[PDB]
Ligand binder design. Structure first.
Ligand SMILES: Nc1ncnc2c1ncn2[C@@H]1O[C@H](COP(=O)(O)OP(=O)(O)OP(=O)(O)O)[C@@H](O)[C@H]1O
Ligand SMILES: [NH3+]Cc1cc(Cl)c(-c2ccccc2)c(Cl)c1
Ligand SMILES: [NH3+]Cc1cc(Cl)c(-c2ccccc2)c(Cl)c1
Ligand SMILES: [NH3+]Cc1cc(Cl)c(-c2ccccc2)c(Cl)c1
Length: 327
């Protein structure tokens, strides 16, 4: 069978905190008043919820209302407990209320509003300094949630709201977040394709906070190399081949051999043999302004097959890539 794995940091957090902290099923939701909120406009719909801009008419503040669809409505206590546990943490979105939508008959989460700057505009114009600045702000959120015994599991730019005018960043959409318990086998059908860690792609269930650090590396590589997405898989199998074309197949085989994981035999026809590439291969005249020796070294330490070998969020904050960032 597979060799077990445990995180190298924050393994004990859910053990030393009381059962009420992580046992989200035992949590009793204190329901707010849906009548306190007035929906203004629909911002969007995913497969988990419909999102609206709204006004809290009791104190006149702008809010965001996420009305859950039945699929996310079953695991509500988990998202609620995680949001309440993380509330007040650096760069974590604030859950302001939980109400029952009168039409859907489902729970609606009410959040603080963030005046998010156009995402295409940020991808196209953030400078090298701004990329470092915002990456540092994301690391504050990730180290906080990891230190609080939670993995986000859906780190990607769509889940990071940036108010560029006020240099304000918030990590949102905690719908796929989980409490980390050493030895627990988790569902590998988490994260969006292009951000999925090799652990998910090889069906290794005993993963941890380090999955977020792979996703963070994917976001950085896309941004600095001007290649969206950096690992462009056609499906979950080709996703691993795209990774192997960069990191190489020898380190992939070392990884699966360390954890006694077997690849799906369907990889025999598509994987091939690939050398590990030097990160300088992805540099060119249209992205060199966003690249540096420190950025490449940092990326090298996040985008590693072995989830135990990646930088932790706190180690990542110490990296030379962030020395230029004003603290
Ligand atoms: N607090 C928020 N402020 C602004 N927009 C938000 C907020 N939370 C979610 N959204 C929007 O709804 C989506 C939620 O999923 C985001 O991608 C974003 O477009
Ligand atoms: N949804 C807005 C958005 C836009 C961008 Cl460009 C980024 C970003 C920042 C630094 C590095 C990589 C990506 C994020 Cl985190 C969020
Ligand atoms: N080590 C992976 C691997 C395994 C196999 Cl079985 C093959 C294969 C497939 C079809 C015909 C002949 C050989 C290849 Cl090319 C690679
Ligand atoms: N933004 C200026 C910049 C960009 C790059 Cl990619 C590099 C570089 C050169 C060779 C190897 C590794 C990194 C340097 Cl030294 C400076």
């Amino acid at each position: 069978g597979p060799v077990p794995s445990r995180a190298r940091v924050y393994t004990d957090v859910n053990t030393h905190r009381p059962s009420e902290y992580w046992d989200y099923e035992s949590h009793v939701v204190e329901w707010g008043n849906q009548d306190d909120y007035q929906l203004v406009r629909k911002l969007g719909r995913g497969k988990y919820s419909e999102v609206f801009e709204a006004i809290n008419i009791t104190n006149n503040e702008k809010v965001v209302v996420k009305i859950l669809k039945p699929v996310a409505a079953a695991k509500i206590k988990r998202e609620i407990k995680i949001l309440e546990n993380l509330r007040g943490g650096p760069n974590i979105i604030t859950l302001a209320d939980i109400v029952k939508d009168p039409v859907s008959r489902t729970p609606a989460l009410v959040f603080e509003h963030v005046n998010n700057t156009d995402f295409k505009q940020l991808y196209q114009t953030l400078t090298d300094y701004d990329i470092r600045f915002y990456m540092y702000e994301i690391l504050k959120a990730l180290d906080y949630c990891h230190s609080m015994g939670i993995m986000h599991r859906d780190v990607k730019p769509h889940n990071v709201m940036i108010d560029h005018e006020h240099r304000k960043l918030r990590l949102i959409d905690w719908g796929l977040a989980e409490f980390y318990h050493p030895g627990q086998e988790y569902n590998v059908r988490v994260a969006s394709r292009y951000f999925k860690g090799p652990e998910l792609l090889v069906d290794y269930q005993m993963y941890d906070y380090s999955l977020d650090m792979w996703s963070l590396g994917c976001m950085l590589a896309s941004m600095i190399f001007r290649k969206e997405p950096f690992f462009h898989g056609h499906d979950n199998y080709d996703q691993l081949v795209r990774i192997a074309k960069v990191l190489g197949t020898e380190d992939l085989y070392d990884y699966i051999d360390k954890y006694n994981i077997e690849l799906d035999p369907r990889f025999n026809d598509i994987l091939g043999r690939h050398s590990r590439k030097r990160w300088e291969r992805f540099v060119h005249s249209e992205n060199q302004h966003l690249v540096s020796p420190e950025a490449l070294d940092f990326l090298d330490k996040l985008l590693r097959y072995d989830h135990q070998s990646r930088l932790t969020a706190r180690e990542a904050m110490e990296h030379p890539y962030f020395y230029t960032v004003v603290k």
